[PDB]
Structures are given as C-alpha cells and as structure tokens.
C-alpha cells in the first residue's frame, strides 16, 4: 500500500542520518587504545595478515 | 498408511499462516484477502488421507 511505501522510505532515511559517534571512534581513537594496552598483556598478540 | 511410515515428507500447515501474517493492508476495508483465503482452506489436526 502507498502509505507503507512512504513510511518505509522515511524510516530508512533516518537510519542513514543517525547521529552515532561509534564509526568515527573506531577510526581515530580505537586503534590508539589497543596500541597502548598491547605491551602490557600477559599473552602478547599473535596475528596473521 | 503404508506410505506414511516410510515417506520423509511432513505436512506442516503453519507455513501458510506465517507467510499470510505479513500482508500489508488497511484495517478500514470491508474485504480482507489474507483472512478470506485462511477461511477457505482451514485444515489442521487432521489425517491428510
């Protein structure tokens, strides 16, 4: 129905423009925190590319 | 009955109910296609002979 189509468009747009601070946090600040913590672990990191 | 004990096919009528519960329609309409089709078929707890 036409009413549902317009409602779905409105809901999707507001999900796209949500004011969430997480994605920027994961790019600029999260790697720094892991770098500081890493030397202090009992089990040092073990990684593959 | 001999076919019943060896066949691996099971008739579960809840499949129809689940797919019919997500039909978009207005509640101010005199006729409802989703409810009418459920009214016509209506076979549960039977033998399916």
- Please state, in angstroms and rounded to a whole number, the distance separating the CA atoms of residues A27 and A33: 11
Q: What technique solved it?
A: cryo-EM
Q: Is the dihedral of CA B19, B25, B26, B31 positive or negative?
A: negative
Structure tokens at A13: 């747009």
- Please state, in angstroms and rounded to a whole number, the distance separating the CA atoms of residues B11 and B46: 10
Structure tokens at A7: 């409602």
Write out chain A residues lying below 8 Å of B24, CB-based: 1, 4
Q: Is the dihedral of CA B16, B17, B23, B26 positive or negative?
A: positive
- Please state, in angstroms and rounded to a whole number, the distance separating the CA atoms of residues A4 and B2: 50
∠ CA A6-A9-A12, nearest 5°, is 150
- Please state, in angstroms and rounded to a whole number, the distance separating the CA atoms of residues A11 and B49: 48
User: Resolution in angstroms, to 1 decimal, for this deposition?
Assistant: 3.0
Place of tokens 């600029």: A28
Write out chain B residues lying below 8 Å of A1, CB-based: 24-26
- Please state, in angstroms and rounded to a whole number, the distance separating the CA atoms of residues B21 and A32: 49
């Amino acid at each position: 129905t036409q009413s549902l189509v317009s409602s779905m468009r409105g809901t999707l747009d507001k999900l796209k423009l949500i004011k969430s601070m997480t994605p920027m946090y994961l790019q600029q600040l999260a790697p720094v925190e892991l770098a500081v913590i890493a030397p202090m672990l009992p089990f040092p990191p073990f990684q593959v590319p | 009955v001999l076919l019943q004990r060896i066949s691996p096919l099971q008739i579960d009528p809840t499949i129809i109910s689940n797919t019919m519960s997500t039909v978009s329609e207005s509640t101010t309409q005199t006729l409802s296609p989703a409810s009418s089709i459920l009214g016509k078929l209506r076979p549960s707890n039977s033998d399916f002979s």
